[PDB]
Every structure is written in C-alpha cells, then in structure tokens.
Design a protein around this ligand. Structure first.
Ligand code: HEM
Ligand code: HEM
Ligand SMILES: Cc1cc(N)nc(CCc2cc(CCCN(C)C)c(F)c(F)c2F)c1
Ligand SMILES: Cc1cc(N)nc(CCc2cc(CCCN(C)C)c(F)c(F)c2F)c1
Ligand SMILES: C[C@H](O)[C@H](O)[C@H]1CNc2nc(N)[nH]c(=O)c2N1
Ligand SMILES: C[C@H](O)[C@H](O)[C@H]1CNc2nc(N)[nH]c(=O)c2N1
Ligand SMILES: [Cl-]
Ligand SMILES: [Cl-]
Ligand SMILES: [Gd]
Ligand SMILES: [Gd]
Ligand SMILES: [Zn+2]
Lengths: 401, 402
C-alpha cells in the first residue's frame, strides 16, 4: 500500500485502491514511463463478473436476491451467444465509473452527474449523425453545458465496428501549403485531407469547422455537415486589450472526445463520444500557444509591445497569461460554461478527499492533472499521486484507417 | 525492446537504450506508477566497484587494457584485505561528474563536464571541514560569477562514524517557530533552526537570518560554525517597474549549495559531499517565495498590484507570480550574480538530451522535476517524453543525522 504525502499541508494517506489495479501499465522497477502519452475467450466472463460485482456493491446490494440472479444471466448469455448485453442502469453505471477511473481527468468531481444516451440500437451512419446531433444539442444547451456521453453499439466479432473518424465532434480544419506550413489547426491536417478526399469542398479559413466522417460497420465513412447553428463558438476578446479581438481568434464551446474506446465489463464500445466543458488552459495555453498547434504566443507578445529579444523578460509567460484571461473573459461574456485551472484543481483536491473515504484512493496521472501553466501555484502540484488502471475505463485505440 | 520516446512539438522519435543498464530499482511496477513521489557484503561492493572501474577505463579509451585489469585486481585485493578500497584522484573526478550527469531531477546538466572537484578525503576534524567549506563557498561564488563545484569529504568506512553536514544547504535562512504556531523566516528550515539554537546558537528574529553550520566529524557531536558574513553573497530583490516591491524587504542568496545528499561511486559512499551550481530563477521566484508552505508572498504581492483577489478567474495568482520571477531575474542581473531563467535552462536541457542520445543512447530524466513550476508547456521539455531510472555513480537522499 503506497504511502502518499501532500507537501503543502504535510498530510499522509495510503492508496489501498491501487491494490486492485487491472491491466498492467508501462512502468517497471528498472524504469518509469509515466511521462509517455501512449503507454506502449472466457476472459470476457471474468471481466463481466467483476463489473456485475462492482455494480451491486455501489447500490449496497452485494450477496442477495438480484445479485446472483444477474450473475447467472450473463453466464447464460455468453454461453449461448459468446457476448452479453448490459442493462441500461449498468450501462449508466459503467459510463460514470469509466469517467471516475480516468487518471488524466481533473474534472472528476463531476463524475456522478453525467447524462447517458443509449444508442446501442443504432443501425447506420445516417442514424449516428442524428444521435451525435442530439448529443451536441443537449450538451451545448445554449451555453449552459451539461456532461453527456452517447454510447453506440458494442463491438462484436465477424462485423466491423462503429467509429467516429474525427478525434472530436468539433475540430478546425488544417490546410497544408505549397511550402509545408499550415493554415488552421496543425493537429487536424490528417483528418482535413481525409474529409477533402471524401468530397468535402474545403475552406480558406483559420477556423473552419470540419465535417464529420462517420463509419457504420463494414462500410466506408460518410461525410456529414454539422448544422452551423448546432456548433456554438466564442469569438475571443480581451477585457482591456482592445486590439485582441482584431486577431480574429475563436474557439468552440463543446469539448467532445469522439475517438476513445469505452470498455465496460469486458464489452468494448469503439464509438462512445463524451463531452463536458473546457478548463480554460486547454484552449488558451495548449490549443492556442503550443508550438505545434496555433502557436499564437509571439503574435500576442508583439501586440503587447513586449521584448521578445530576451527570454529573461518573461514575454512568453506574460502573453500566455493574457491569452488565458481573454479565454475566460470571452466565455463568461458569452455565458458559456468554462472553468479556470485554479478552480478546477481545488475541486480535484476535494475529489481526492472524497475518493479517499469512498474507495481508499484515486488513480491520478500527476503530469496531466497539473495544469500547463502555473503548476506549483495550484494545490495538485504539491500532492503526491498514484497512477494505475481500473475497469470500466476509457481506452485509446488505433485510428480506424 | 527499448522504450520508444516521442517529442510532441517536433515529432521526433528515439529509443532509450541506456535504460536497459539501470543499476538499481525504482518505485514503479506494471501495476502502479509512483513517479510523482518525492522520495522513491564484499561481493556486492566488488561488482559495483568493477562496474565503475569499467566505466572509468571506457571513458579514457583504455577498456580491456593492461592498466584496466591491473586496477580491477588492485580493487579485488584491497576489498579482500580491508573490506573496502580507495579511489584514485582521477577516478574521483570522473565519478563526481558522472554522478551529476546521472541525476534525473537536474535540468542544469548541460554543464556536467564543467565541475570543479575539491578532494577533501584527507579531512581530519570538523574544524578542517569548516575551512574546506568556506573555501568551497569562496571559489563557487567568485564575486557573483558562479562556478560549479563539489567538495568530497572522507568516505564511509568500517570502524568510524560518518562526516555529516547537518544543514540541507550551506546557505539557508532561519525559520523561527512562533506562537501562533506561525513561522518567521523560512518554514522549510524550522527543524535545523531549532537544532542550531539547541547547540548554542543565539537566534535572530528576522526573516532572512543566515543559519550557522552544524558540522559532524566521525563519532563526535555536531559542532556549530558561523559563516563569515563576507563569504555569503546575497541579492536584495527589486522590480524593474514596480517601485514598491523593494519595500517588501525581500532577499535571496547567490549560491545554491546542496549539502545533505550522499555521493555514491563504485559502491563507496560519501555521506558528506556538498555541491553547488547557480540558480534557476523559478526556484527562488516561484517555489521559495510563492509556495504556500514557504515564504508565501503571492497574495501580498497581488494586493499591492491592485489585482482582483476575490475571484480565481482574474488569474491574479498567475500575474503576481510572473512579476515575482521578473523581480528575481532583474535583481540578480542588476547584482551581476549568475542566474538562468526557465526558458533558457529548458532549452539547454534539450540540447543535453540530444548530446546524451548520441553519447550513451539515452538520458535518465524525471519529467515532473524537469518541467518548471510555472509556464510548463511554454518550455520545450513539457513536450518531450522522458524515461526515469537510476544509474550509478549517483547522488542519493539519506536520512537526517538526527
Ligand atoms: C465536465 C467537466 C470536465 C472537465 C473540466 C474536464 C477536464 C479535463 C482535462 C483538462 C483533461 C486533460 C486532457 C487534455 O489535456 O487534453 C481531461 C482528460 C480526460 N477526461 Fe475530462 N473533463 C470534463 C469532463 C469529462 C467527461 C464528462 C468525461 C467522460 C465521461 C471525461 C473523460 C476524460 C478522459 C478519458 C480524459 C483523458 C483524455 C486522454 O487521455 O486523451 N472528462 N479532462
Ligand atoms: C550549474 C547550474 C545548475 C542548474 C541551473 C541546476 C538546476 C537544477 C534544478 C532547477 C533542480 C531542481 C531542484 C529543485 O527544484 O529544488 C536541480 C536538481 C538537482 N541538481 Fe542541479 N543545477 C545546477 C548544478 C548542479 C550541480 C553542479 C550538481 C552536482 C554536482 C547538481 C545536481 C543536482 C541534483 C543531485 C539534483 C536533485 C536534487 C534533489 O532531488 O534533491 N546540479 N538542479
Ligand atoms: C470531455 C473532456 C472535457 C475536457 N475539458 N477536456 C477533455 C480533453 C480530451 C483531450 C485529450 C487529448 C489527449 C490525446 C487525444 N487523442 C486524440 C489521442 C488531447 F490531446 C486533447 F486535445 C484533448 F482535448 C475532454
Ligand atoms: C546544486 C543545485 C543547483 C540548483 N540550481 N538547484 C538545486 C536544488 C536542489 C534542491 C532539492 C530539493 C529536494 C528535496 C530534498 N531535500 C529536502 C533534502 C529541495 F527541496 C531543495 F530546496 C533544493 F534546493 C541544487
Ligand atoms: C511529453 C508529455 O508527456 C506530453 O506533452 C503530455 C504532458 N502532460 C499533459 N497533460 C495534459 N493534460 N495534456 C497533455 O496533452 C499532456 N501532454
Ligand atoms: C509532490 C510533487 O512530486 C512535488 O511537489 C514535486 C513535483 N516536482 C518538483 N520539481 C522540482 N524541480 N522540484 C520540486 O521540489 C518538485 N516537487
Ligand atoms: Cl481541445
Ligand atoms: Cl533553494
Ligand atoms: Gd501600437
Ligand atoms: Gd512604476
Ligand atoms: Zn512510473
């Protein structure tokens, strides 16, 4: 049982929940690989059994009546069919657990408040689009964002999978050049040239919302144009830097991850988009200032008349703070839900305290919980953390092409 | 099967083959990663010794030579006759540099080859220890043009207690427990402050009172030594445009000299071997001054800046911290005392990683310690996957001698 210390307060806890760690991680006694982004059949019944036990534990209902009853049914279902179906309440329970188990998510204080749309009877990419359109409408909610997941049919042998080829439901185009440089978002150059390959008339803008490439089983993807009124965006302005608006920056309201695989009780859902609301550093620090993303830092510094000729002026740090200010200001003025990294980390510390008493610990990935600016100014920096894998879970998966 | 490592800013991919040589074991398992935790027999002495001797003879292009096997035999024979062995002077220099080179938590390692090694393994007493330490401070400080150095005191050996420096650094500010339970001065130094008083030091009552040294010779109580004031170079903190900042009365010292770590070379242990370089500005401006459990000045500065401190979304904390770090950089430059900002230091560390990939096939690095505590993703090391592991020679933590 690893001892874990908080260095701001001096308090000590023990992560006994780590003792239940499932699939192995990438680290060994000889070397730590914790900073890497991607870590390098009656088994279905062992995973389903454990998940069923998880479910009845939470509702205080282990070891009586409906517990064993549900245990025999999954056995019989897998015996007769090779797989099984989750009850709607279990699907709801599994989706919230997978979020609760996500070591890289700093917003898990919200994990109990999640709206689950059950799309396991979807039949075509046409239907997907209507589902995705329903999700976006619900989650966006005129700017009062609501956490939501839409769960499409599970993987089954013999047939292809449902897949959303985009990494997010809302992404901006990345247009290559005669000279290699990119207009738009460099992170989406690949899917941009895919969408263009499947017939999408490209734009000429820095912030063109890409179409969706949606894949029903055993069929090639189909392009769908997202209804422009369904995509809520926020023009970025600064509260006092009048010229900031003239930079023409914008970002969208809804962060909806559409390329991760949801795994519950041994079942796999390769199409299960989930959405919450943004922490402001995600937009203002990573999306806008990463060198391989929009890389706007020096343009803002020039406008601020900062001395970009010496690193020790801290011009980078100054421009970054004002970009993050512009993001928070713009989203608040638009009445679109957003949370700053100070508020989010303080709530995560509360979440850790809750999870200590509820489960004996919390899987947390320090490198991803600590925000990309002002790290040691937040309480999570001074909190030791233990990282490990539990099921239900959101897993990474290969791109479908 | 060597770890593949990606840089996400550029797209580069390398393989850390050096990691396959990790001489000891860390805290992680395939079950769980503990990377974020702060604190993670003749035959076995011989095999450590043999490995270090192999390293040294490789470095001087004498691998497998007459002199190489001769040294191996000399060490085998001394361990059999005495239980231990003595390093040659050139082996100690090589081993101290390698220990720095191998330190996973040091972002300053582009400098590792430029290290001045003072051999004090002949030191006899705590009074001689104090004289060696004073000369280290004088050489390293160099009137503000700082020079990296280490002074190596006698090794742990059978029959005798250890040399120990009780202070965690050679220069440290007292922390006076008080009665709100509050601390005046540096809260990190409350324990050592109380030990100094208990050992005859007449305390002060300021926030920046330089501590005396508590020096321990083999099998003796520690002995208290005051640092000659003209050896301790300090920098008053001012801000280039916020003129009220000087009235805070803040100061920091020029020389970061870690004095409580253990230096291990070929199985030999040097419990006393203080080493010093020069500061990265975030160490002072962000950690020492802004940590809630250190001087904790952030809110006071933000109030003086007229920032709105009743809402987090004003980013008042971020804005005050940036100006504190500016103050440190400006003040050390004004004083002509070496200091490196977090952008230049992380840029130089990336070149070190590239140098090391060609030289050794990798580089042990602790991502959480390498990425600066402010502006993390604005520096190139944020975007660089790293592999953490333990090579020897090495600097190691050791328990406090009390
Ligand atoms: C509601 C407010 C939420 C906030 C403030 C939030 C915040 C964050 C942040 C900042 C990250 C870091 C990822 C990055 O840097 O790109 C993250 C990761 C993650 N979040 Fe959340 N999130 C929220 C909702 C959700 C929901 C509703 C789910 C799932 C049901 C979820 C699942 C995840 C997962 C799986 C990751 C890991 C991403 C990856 O490894 O690629 N989050 N979250
Ligand atoms: C010359 C310029 C140097 C710079 C800019 C530098 C920078 C740093 C920084 C920023 C840290 C993080 C520690 C903290 O946050 O408190 C560190 C750690 C460390 N440095 Fe360096 N350093 C330098 C010289 C040296 C030298 C000369 C040595 C040894 C000969 C050394 C060995 C170490 C070790 C062992 C650690 C780990 C300390 C610990 O974990 O307690 N450094 N360094
Ligand atoms: C629901 C949600 C709310 C929120 N507030 N934030 C996120 C963040 C997810 C995310 C994860 C990653 C990691 C890799 C991505 N996949 C394609 C490999 C990103 F890079 C990224 F930009 C990104 F937004 C999700
Ligand atoms: C030569 C050198 C140059 C430089 N630029 N920086 C350092 C910083 C070392 C350091 C390490 C730690 C880790 C904890 C171990 N200690 C408690 C025994 C500190 F806490 C600390 F304050 C501290 F300065 C050293
Ligand atoms: C190389 C490094 O692991 C990589 O840049 C990680 C670091 N921490 C992160 N943390 C978050 N939240 N998101 C990220 O994309 C990353 N990237
Ligand atoms: C708990 C956490 O590991 C701790 O605060 C670490 C994180 N990274 C650090 N990095 C550096 N350079 N110095 C530190 O003291 C720490 N502290
Ligand atoms: Cl994003
Ligand atoms: Cl320090
Ligand atoms: Gd102007
Ligand atoms: Gd002024
Ligand atoms: Zn690890």
């Amino acid at each position: 049982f690893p001892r874990v210390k908080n260095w701001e307060v001096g308090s000590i806890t023990y992560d006994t929940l780590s003792a239940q760690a499932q699939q192995d991680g990438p680290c060994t006694p000889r070397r730590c690989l914790g900073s890497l982004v991607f870590p390098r059949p009656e088994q279905l019944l062992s995973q389903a059994r454990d998940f069923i036990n998880q479910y009845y534990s939470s509702i205080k209902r282990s070891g009586s009546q409906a517990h064993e009853q549900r245990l025999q049914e999954v056995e019989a279902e897998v015996a007769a069919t090779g797989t099984y179906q989750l009850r709607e309440s279990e699907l709801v329970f599994g989706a919230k657990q997978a979020w609760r188990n996500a070591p890289r998510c700093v917003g898990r204080i919200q994990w109990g408040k999640l709206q689950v749309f059950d799309a396991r009877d979807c039949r075509s990419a046409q239907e997907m689009f209507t589902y995705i359109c329903n999700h976006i409408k619900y989650a966006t909610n005129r700017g009062n964002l609501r956490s939501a997941i839409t769960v499409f049919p599970q993987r089954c042998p013999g047939r292809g999978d449902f897949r959303i080829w985009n990494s997010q439901l809302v992404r901006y185009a990345g247009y290559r050049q005669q000279d290699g440089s990119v207009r738009g978002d460099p992170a989406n150059v690949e899917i941009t040239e895919l969408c263009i390959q499947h017939g999408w008339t490209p734009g000429n803008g820095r912030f063109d919302v890409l179409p969706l490439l949606l894949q029903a089983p055993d069929e090639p993807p189909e392009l769908f144009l997202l209804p422009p009124e369904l995509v809520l965006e926020v023009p970025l302005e600064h509260p006092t830097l009048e010229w900031f608006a003239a930079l023409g920056l914008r970002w969208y309201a809804l962060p909806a991850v559409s390329n991760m695989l949801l795994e519950i009780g041994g079942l796999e859902f390769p199409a299960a988009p989930f959405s919450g609301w943004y922490m402001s550093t995600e937009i203002g620090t990573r999306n806008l200032c990463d060198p391989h993303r929009y890389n706007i830092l020096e343009d803002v510094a020039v406008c601020m008349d900062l001395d970009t000729r010496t690193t020790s002026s801290l011009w980078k740090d100054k421009a970054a703070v004002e970009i993050n200010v512009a993001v928070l200001h713009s989203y608040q003025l638009a009445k679109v839900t957003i949370v700053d990294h100070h508020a989010a980390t303080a709530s995560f510390m509360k979440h850790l305290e809750n999870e200590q008493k509820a489960r004996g610990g919390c899987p947390a990935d320090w490198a991803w919980i600590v925000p990309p600016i002002s790290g040691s100014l937040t309480p999570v920096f001074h909190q030791e953390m233990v990282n490990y894998f539990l099921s239900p879970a959101f897993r990474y998966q290969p791109d479908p092409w």
